[PDB]
Amino acid sequence: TCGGETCSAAQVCLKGKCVCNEVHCRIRCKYGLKKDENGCEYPCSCAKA
């Protein structure tokens, strides 16, 4: 575990906390990237607005 929590596939355990991993997306989107419920932009997809 990561400090009492399980990190999602979008996160990495750094210093005992789940944080979003670095973001590298090639798609170009009118409203930018979609965030999951932790705020992370993984997998890369265009946001609905």
Coordinates of C-alpha atoms in Angstrom, one line a residue:
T1 CA 0.0 0.0 0.0
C2 CA 0.8 3.7 -0.3
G3 CA 0.3 5.2 3.1
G4 CA -3.0 3.8 4.0
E5 CA -4.3 4.0 0.4
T6 CA -4.3 2.1 -2.9
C7 CA -3.2 4.3 -5.7
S8 CA -5.1 4.1 -9.0
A9 CA -3.5 3.3 -12.3
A10 CA -3.2 7.0 -13.0
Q11 CA -1.2 7.6 -9.7
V12 CA 2.2 6.8 -8.3
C13 CA 3.3 6.5 -4.7
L14 CA 5.9 9.2 -4.0
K15 CA 6.9 9.9 -0.4
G16 CA 4.0 7.9 0.9
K17 CA 1.2 9.6 -0.9
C18 CA -0.7 8.8 -4.0
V19 CA -0.2 11.6 -6.6
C20 CA -1.0 11.8 -10.3
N21 CA 1.8 10.7 -12.5
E22 CA 3.4 12.9 -15.1
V23 CA 1.2 13.7 -18.0
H24 CA 2.3 13.2 -21.6
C25 CA -0.6 13.3 -24.1
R26 CA -0.3 13.9 -27.8
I27 CA -4.0 14.6 -28.5
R28 CA -5.0 18.2 -29.0
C29 CA -8.4 18.9 -27.5
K30 CA -10.8 22.0 -27.6
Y31 CA -11.4 21.8 -23.9
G32 CA -8.2 20.1 -22.8
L33 CA -7.8 16.7 -21.1
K34 CA -10.4 14.7 -19.1
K35 CA -9.7 14.4 -15.4
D36 CA -10.6 11.3 -13.3
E37 CA -12.1 11.7 -9.9
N38 CA -8.7 12.4 -8.3
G39 CA -7.9 15.0 -10.9
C40 CA -5.5 12.9 -12.9
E41 CA -5.3 13.1 -16.7
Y42 CA -4.9 9.4 -17.5
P43 CA -5.7 7.8 -19.8
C44 CA -5.4 10.6 -22.3
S45 CA -8.9 11.7 -23.5
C46 CA -10.5 15.0 -24.5
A47 CA -12.7 16.6 -21.8
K48 CA -16.3 17.1 -22.5
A49 CA -16.0 20.8 -21.7

